DNA sequence: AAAAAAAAAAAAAAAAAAAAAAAATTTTTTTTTTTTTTTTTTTTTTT
């Protein structure tokens, strides 16, 4: 119970006189500039930082957290009232809604009669004239909650949760303010929408129609009405924060406006937003009372961990001649040895360069075939955690529709939508397929098609589509033409006992068990964040093969093909592999031209991978 | 205003009796201490023992168990008054306090099949298995509204009429002011309580074999919502009532009955564990810190003779190693996997059943009785919302526990391959297009396999006698070949032990009678001395309960490898990999990989935990080395 | 009254059928306790006034 | 329960202003002395001079005159709070402390003829002669019942819905328990309020000559019932309101009006 | 000052204007639950 006029004045003071040094120690009035852009219509969403609010008024932040929707509306009204005094020039009428807004304001000014008192139902709804949205960036003090722990005590509260996106619908038009036009009076009726559904109006309430006592039927218009991009996603508990014997819990997040098209399935997302109910009318409730479903009205969605979205010394380390070896070493440092396999996995992460002269994929596929207990699954899991877009499939737990897509009954409307499996979620990413050799034949055929065509051609009963799965494949198996012909690299890992090697491995593993970290080396291994940043910086560095390298590459190919022919499998795929591996090496070296060193390292990797087969 | 109550003799008597029962200073003080405990823990429900209530006041016990609603109302009023007396500032925080019950209910302890009309309005205790667990929905009990036109704020109060007659005026949610101004509901100020509905089914083992199951619907209000999940065995105590229908000029006699749970408790009363016992454990650890491990090993399975190394390994399993969660999220498992590959009638199955009875969260699985989705996680569709849901399997349930896989060898290769991830990294990664999940199952596997041909042919190598591939065997950190040795002396020992155990009789409880073939007495699974007395007929031995408590306390301790033990283990592992570690005529029972070094580290940590060492020393390392040496080699005769 | 032989091929769960009901008026809250329900499969039409 | 107001800004402001006016200690304690005098005399109706009220706060005076029921309720709450502050036991003894008005009413001072519908829900000071009176009847404001079968003792309260929407639920006198146990009313414990109805006619020497006289019905309650008898030239200060009709289904739009007297004076 | 006539009043009987009281089950819908069918997926057997 507080004076909302006073609260509105407080938020207005904050917005108008808050400042920070975000730009090289220059007081710039952050939210003032944002308001300027909002008035100019160059910005749709405004993200208020509750950390900034608390910098001066912590109790206001507490009030917002205790009752966010109310204070969300208060901030929206404050911005609405502030826009005119920040407006500096005329809007360019970005869209049809802007045209409608200007027309309505113009004719309201025309029929103003300023002194006349207008009925409350005789004005434009506030949401009908916004063209902007206001969301809250949760305070840093608020520790993130857990989907299971967010309960009725948090209803109406600004909670921040973290989880995996298991599903997200496609952006749909959700009506905010329905508009109607009458067949008698030429006046517009408006119906703001708060319930999940609504009943369209029949008769017109316009003063003219009421006076004339005409029929005054009115027709619903999608033109003057106001819509907002609407998405419905489901976030899931992280594995590390589920109870002992419990399966992770899922929360329905509703995203609207500029927050849509930020989170896709499989992303690690931290969602700040308001926990709210939805009345459960209709259902013959078992228990009397106003029981209601729940959801999270999203305000700020951020990508976490691998889903995440430089300094002179950083550029120095990139330029350093040993940068490639540093990156190859930093991958899974707790796993001893396997320097060459680490280099191969780094190349798989970086990728080659896609060419569409007939489109030839630039992905690198690697299959670690090996003896039991040789870190195959450990490296697969490390890549799964590292690669920004990655999926992990162990055996037949995720088989069939777990790899491909399936038709599932949608919820926002109710219909057969298409949900993507592991391969789809790994699209333009990595799929780590452990226990490859034990996989079902159908899944193996699907992986075969994905490794070459980058697609999944499903023609089952309920589904007939061609999914796009542009994912590199890092498979693991234990002891072959059926795999050597296809996979870009086939790497054999045999653990042959040896006194010195086993002693070193035992020392390494014992130190790991002691200090929960890899033994110190000459160079500190790079963090997952830095590694992902460098990998991404390498992705957008497409180099090209000079005409000079043609002779050298052809000579190498013919030589290796002679070796394969003489010995007791080489093909054009071998030369393609050399090309894409060399391009990946060039990407890592930050050059636009593939070089002799690149081709040399490609051939060395191929030679050692094949030597592993013997 | 309406018809308030001026004075009520029965209510006053009930509240006075309950306040007297709760105020315990002239008495022992149990419930005063319990109220202080809940105040300290910031809760608003007290668990009151029906046995204590009956002891102090028979009349109040009968009244509470026969007319629960108003009696529980009076009890909760007394509870709030008592909490205010102890500290009013905390009593003001919570609107109401709740009274759950426990203890023994004579005829009110029933199964969903036996919960009939006779128990309507009474307090009942029902033990069963959860089948359905709806979502936790907020139910509004006090709604705050704001009128922008008049700046007024209003509060609407809705009574919990779940089982009482409700009229529409009670449930009318306000939307317009008196003069039809729009009202905006303030969610941040309104009050909601979590509400859930579950279903409790007659336990499959206790239900009659012939007929179909019987179930009961249970309403859980705040503080009792996420206490149970489908498939769990739980005890729910609450009032069995009738749910009102809906307004209608016609009605059939039928009524929909439910159970408003006042408390819910896990069947896994064994999943959880005094200063006397704590000091006893401290002295036991301190006194004989070297032979404590051996004494525990020998006392582990008293009814099974011999198998010293097998029992040592089982103790190491029950203790578990120390997991290593690295700075990069990498995971090194701490659980320990044992495969008893053995000749018929060598007590491997009995060891499995011992671990079932002893260890917390032990799940019994069989070769072909738990296939695929039943053994690991699964994905299904709700069939009502058309949405995909996870379903925990045997190992997901056994997370932070043990899975006893009898007849492991006769599992399909599909299932055995599916179990690889659980064995290695302790999780199940399952995905269908709709939903992908990474469930945690950090379980330890105790498998009981018989060799190909039925009986272990000692002339053939262990690789041949074990019909399993090296990739699978590497999963099991310890592999014990348990032969039915034909030594007459050991035969004498075993026969004497068996006959002594068969001759044993219960002390006093039995005198020549027959063991009987449950609702009459409280259910043991839910029921609330260092050494055994040296009976000559059982010994010719640490107590079971003290062993349980000591293992529980020693599980938490996290010993850290010391440099000396690390060097010793590394040298021994190098030798084990080397060829010289095995002489002629000895064959490896399982290939030695880095998995075996992890086995050594885990076994040494388990030994250090048995000793509560806080450091894994050369003693522990040597014991682990010796056990691995015994387990990983076999001498093949010609 | 009939005596017949047969075999039971199903048996529904045991539910609660009211033998007496107490109906309360919404306006004055006055009650009409102890209305004798008929036995068997049969319903009761509540008073309208 | 039901709707309960939390932040009624107008009610809070009215209570604050009325309590400030009744403080009076710095303002030569006129109303402080009046409250003390009524406390000593064992009275529970304070007569307030509207001229002093207007001098202190013209806003409150206008609000009270033009909105009778709301402002009178706020004034009575403030008076009860003040009476509790001066002496708590007396405040607890008397449930509700009433406020009557006195002084110079610029336009509200009228006669039964000039009293038109423009004064509904306002404070009017009407002069006239009592043409007739009614017997003083007790209306039950709080009934107490005892159930011999269960020894329970219930207490029902009836609100003063004289000029407010009233439903059958509010005006039902319990005669049985929830289990159909006959009750017995405790007349001694029950609370009754005396109520009377009089008729004020325009003074013949003031009425226009040769015309029939104009009358008005006045409702007097506890502590004002027997303040006048037929033939008394009385000044009644009260609130003019429309009396609700019986639950119908068809309404003719005609509403009997009446004056809920808050003060009665003789010559 | 007394008798008769006039009228003046009091009380009782009667007839409308407005308000108040009395009387009131049956048809159709939808939701849940349960079952049946199709296709895909998985499992098992034979070569
Ligand atoms: N070269 C190595 N360096 C460090 N640890 C290793 C090495 N090889 C195996 N390990 C350890 O041994 C275990 C077995 O490896 P894992 O990859 O699970 O077997 P697989 O290769 O069959 O998947 C892992 O826990 C891993 O940490
Ligand atoms: N060493 C032993 N000590 C005690 N009992 C034994 C021993 N060996 C066999 N038995 C007895 O033989 C029976 C074998 O049954 P079980 O253990 O279920 O089969 P298996 O021994 O093949 O696992 C048990 O009832 C057990 O009492
Ligand atoms: Mg593996
Ligand atoms: Mg057996
Ligand atoms: Zn119109
Ligand atoms: Zn009634």
General description of the model:
The PDB classes it as replication. The entry lists the keywords complex, helicase, replication, AAA+ ATPase. The entry is titled "Cryo-EM structure of a human MCM2-7 double hexamer on dsDNA". The structure is cut from a larger assembly and holds 1 copy of chain A (614 residues), 2 copies of chain B and 1 copy of chain C (49 residues). Chain A is of the alpha/beta class. In chain A, 36% of the residues lie in helices and 21% in strands. Chain A has 19 helices and 18 strands. Chain A has helices spanning 4-17, 30-39, 50-54, 58-66, 68-86, 96-110, 207-212, 312-319, 323-330, 339-350, 376-386, 422-426, 441-453, 481-484, 499-515, 528-539, 549-566, 572-589, 596-613; strands at 45-49, 133-137, 158-168, 172-182, 188-192, 218-236, 250-256, 268-279, 292-303, 366-370, 390-394, 406-409, 416-419, 430-434, 455-458, 465-468, 472-477, 489-493. In chain A, the strands form 5 sheets. Chain A has a 5-stranded mixed beta barrel. In chain A, strands 11-14-17-10-18 form a 5-stranded parallel beta sheet. Chain A has a two-stranded parallel ribbon with strand order 1-2. In chain A, helix 9 (323-330) packs across helix 10. Chain B has 22 helices and 27 strands. In chain B, helix 1 (9-22) packs across helix 5 (68-86), helix 4 packs across helix 5 (68-86) and helix 21 crosses helix 22. By secondary structure, chain C is an all-beta fold. Chain C is built from no helices and 4 strands. Strand 7 (153-157) of chain B pairs antiparallel with strand 1 of chain D. One magnesium ion binds next to helix 11 of chain A. Chain A binds one DNA strand of 47 nucleotides through residues 282-284, 399-401, 440, 442, 460-462.
Tag the structure with descriptive keywords.
part of a larger assembly, 4 chains, B: 638 residues, alpha/beta, five-stranded mixed beta barrel, five-stranded parallel beta sheet, C: mainly beta, two-stranded antiparallel ribbon, 18% strand, elongated, binds magnesium ion, binds zinc ion, DNA-binding, DNA replication licensing factor MCM5 (chain C), DNA-binding (chain B), DNA replication (chain B), acetylation (chain B)
What's this entry about, in short?
The structure is cut from a larger assembly and holds one copy of chain A (614 residues), two copies of chain B and one copy of chain C (49 residues). Chain A has 614 residues and is of the alpha/beta class.
């Amino acid at each position: 119970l507080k004076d909302y006029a006073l609260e509105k004045e407080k938020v207005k003071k904050f917005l108008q006189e808050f400042y920070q040094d975000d730009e090289l120690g220059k007081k710039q009035f952050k939210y003032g500039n944002q308001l300027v852009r909002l008035a100019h219509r160059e910005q749709v969403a405004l993200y208020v930082d509750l950390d900034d609010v608390a910098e001066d008024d912590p109790e206001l932040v507490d009030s917002i957290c205790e009752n966010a929707r109310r204070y969300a509306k208060l901030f929206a009204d404050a911005v609405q009232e502030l826009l005119p005094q920040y407006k500096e020039r005329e809007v360019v009428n970005k869209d049809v809604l802007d045209v409608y807004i200007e027309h309505r304001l113009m004719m309201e000014q025309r029929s103003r009669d300023p002194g006349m008192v207008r009925s409350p139902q005789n004005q434009y709804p506030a949401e009908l004239m916004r063209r902007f949205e206001l969301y809250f960036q949760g305070p840093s003090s608020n520790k993130p909650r857990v989907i299971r722990e967010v309960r009725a005590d948090s209803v109406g509260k600004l909670v921040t949760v973290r989880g995996i996106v298991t599903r997200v619908s496609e952006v749909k038009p959700k009506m905010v303010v329905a508009t109607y036009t009458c067949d008698q009076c030429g006046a517009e009726t408006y119906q703001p929408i708060q319930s999940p559904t609504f009943m369209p109006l029949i008769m017109c309430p316009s003063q003219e129609c009421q006076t004339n006592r005409s029929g005054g039927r009115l027709y619903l218009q999608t033109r003057g009405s106001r819509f907002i991009k609407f998405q419905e996603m489901k976030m899931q508990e992280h594995s590390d924060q589920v109870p002992v014997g419990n399966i992770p819990r899922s929360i329905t997040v509703l995203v609207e406006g500029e927050n849509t098209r930020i989170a896709q399935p499989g992303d690690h997302v931290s969602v700040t937003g308001i926990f709210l109910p939805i009345l459960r009318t209709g259902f013959r409730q078992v228990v009397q009372g106003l029981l209601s479903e729940t959801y999270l009205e999203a305000h700020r969605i951020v990508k976490m961990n691998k889903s995440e979205d430089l300094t002179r010394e950083e550029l120095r380390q990139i330029a350093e001649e040993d940068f490639y070896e540093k990156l190859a070493a930093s991958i899974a440092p707790e796993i001893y040895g396997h320097e060459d396999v680490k280099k191969a996995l780094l190349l798989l992460l970086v990728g080659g360069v896609d060419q569409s002269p007939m489109k030839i994929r630039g992905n690198i596929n690697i299959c670690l075939m090996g003896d039991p207990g040789v870190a195959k699954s450990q490296l697969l899991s490390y890549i799964d955690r590292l690669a920004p877009r990655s999926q992990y499939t162990t055996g037949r737990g995720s088989s069939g529709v777990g790899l491909t897509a399936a038709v599932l009954r949608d919820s926002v409307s109710g219909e057969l939508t298409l949900e993507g499996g592991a391969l789809v979620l790994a699209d333009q990413g990595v799929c780590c397929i452990d226990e490859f050799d034990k996989m079902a034949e159908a899944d193996r055929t699907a992986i075969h098609e994905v490794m070459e065509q980058q697609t999944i051609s499903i023609a089952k009963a309920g589904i007939l589509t061609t999914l796009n799965a542009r994912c590199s494949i890092l498979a693991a198996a234990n002891p072959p033409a059926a795999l050597l012909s296809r996979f870009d690299l086939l790497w054999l890992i045999q653990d042959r006992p040896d006194r010195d090697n086993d002693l070193r491995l035992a020392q390494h593993i014992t130190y790991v068990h002691q200090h929960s970290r890899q033994p110190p080396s000459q160079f500190e291994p790079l963090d997952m964040k830095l590694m992902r940043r460098y990998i991404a910086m390498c992705r957008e560095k497409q180099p090209m093969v000079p005409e000079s390298l043609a002779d050298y590459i052809t000579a190498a190919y013919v030589e290796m093909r002679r070796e394969a022919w003489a010995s007791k499998y080489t093909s054009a795929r071998t030369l393609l592999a050399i090309l894409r591996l060399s391009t990946a090496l060039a990407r890592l070296r930050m050059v636009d031209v593939v070089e002799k060193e690149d081709v040399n390292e490609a051939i060395r990797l191929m030679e050692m991978s094949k030597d592993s087969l013997l | 205003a309406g018809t308030v109550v001026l004075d009520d003799v029965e209510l006053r008597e009930a509240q006075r009796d309950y306040l007297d029962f709760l105020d315990d200073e002239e008495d022992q003080g149990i419930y005063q201490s319990k109220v202080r405990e809940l105040i300290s823990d910031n809760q608003y429900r007290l668990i009151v023992n029906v046995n204590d209530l009956r002891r102090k006041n028979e009349k109040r016990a009968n009244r509470l168990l026969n007319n629960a609603f108003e009696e529980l109302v009076a009890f909760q009023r007394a509870l709030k008054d008592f909490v205010a007396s102890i500290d009013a500032t905390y009593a003001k925080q919570y609107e109401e306090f709740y009274v759950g019950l426990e203890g023994s209910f004579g005829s009110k302890h029933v199964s969903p099949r036996t919960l009939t009309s006779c128990f309507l309005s009474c307090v009942v205790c029902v033990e069963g298995i959860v089948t359905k667990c709806s979502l936790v929905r907020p139910k509004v009990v006090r709604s705050v509204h704001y009128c922008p036109a008049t700046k007024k704020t209003i509060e609407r109060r809705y009574s919990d009429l779940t089982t009482l007659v409700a009229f529409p005026s009670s449930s009318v949610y306000p939307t317009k002011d008196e003069e039809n101004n729009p009202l905006e509901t303030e969610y941040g100020l309104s009050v909601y309580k979590d509400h859930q509905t579950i279903t409790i089914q007659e336990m499959p083992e206790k239900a009659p074999a012939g007929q179909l199951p019987r179930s009961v619907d249970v309403i859980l209000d705040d503080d009792l919502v996420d206490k149970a999940k489908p498939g769990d065995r739980v005890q729910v105590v609450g009032t069995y009532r009738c749910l009102p229908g809906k307004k209608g000029g016609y009605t059939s006699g039928t009524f929909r009955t439910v159970l408003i749970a006042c408390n819910v408790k896990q069947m896994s009363k064994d999943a959880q564990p005094s200063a006397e016992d704590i000091a006893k454990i401290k002295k036991f650890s301190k006194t004989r810190s070297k032979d404590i491990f051996d004494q525990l090993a020998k006392s582990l399975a008293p009814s099974i003779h011999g198998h010293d190394y097998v029992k040592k390994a089982i103790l190491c399993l029950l203790l578990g190693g120390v997991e290593r969660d690295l700075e990069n999220g990498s995971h090194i498992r701490g659980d320990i996997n044992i495969l008893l590959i053995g000749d018929p009638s060598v007590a491997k199955s009995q060891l499995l059943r011992y671990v079932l009875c002893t260890a917390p969260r032990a799940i019994p699985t069989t070769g072909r009785g738990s296939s695929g989705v039943g053994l690991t996680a699964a994905v299904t569709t709700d069939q009502e919302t058309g949405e995909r849901r996870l379903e925990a399997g045997a190992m997901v349930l056994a997370d932070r526990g043990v899975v006893c896989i009898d007849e492991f060898d006769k599992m399909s290769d599909m299932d055995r391959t599916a179990i690889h991830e659980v064995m290695e990294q302790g999780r199940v990664t399952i995905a269908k297009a709709g939903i992908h999940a990474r469930l945690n199952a950090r379980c330890s596997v105790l498998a009981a396999a018989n060799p190909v041909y039925g009986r272990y042919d000692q002339y053939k190598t262990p690789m041949e006698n074990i019909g399993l591939q090296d990739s699978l065997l590497s999963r099991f950190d310890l592999l014990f070949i348990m032969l039915d040795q034909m030594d007459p002396e050991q035969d004498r020992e075993i026969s004497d032990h068996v006959l002594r155990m068969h001759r044993y009789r219960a002390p006093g409880e039995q005198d020549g009678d027959a063991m009987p073939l449950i609702l009459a007495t409280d259910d043991p699974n839910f029921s609330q001395q260092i050494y055994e007395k040296h009976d000559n007929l059982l010994h010719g031995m640490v107590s079971a309960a003290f062993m349980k408590k000591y293992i529980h306390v020693a599980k938490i301790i996290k010993p850290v490898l010391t440099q000396e033990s690390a060097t010793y283990i590394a040298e021994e592992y190098s030798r084990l990999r080397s060829q010289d570690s095995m002489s002629s005529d000895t064959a490896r029972t399982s290939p030695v990989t880095a998995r075996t070094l992890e086995t050594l580290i885990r076994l040494a940590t388990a030994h250090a935990k048995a000793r509560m060492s806080k450091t894994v020393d050369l003693q522990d390392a040597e014991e682990a080395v010796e056990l691995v040496q015994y387990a990983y080699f076999k001498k093949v005769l010609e | 009254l009939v005596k017949i032989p047969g075999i039971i091929i199903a048996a529904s769960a045991v539910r609660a059928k009211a033998t007496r009901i107490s109906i309360q008026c919404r306006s004055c809250r006055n009650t009409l306790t102890n209305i004798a329900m008929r036995p068997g499969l049969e319903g009761y039409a509540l008073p309208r006034k």
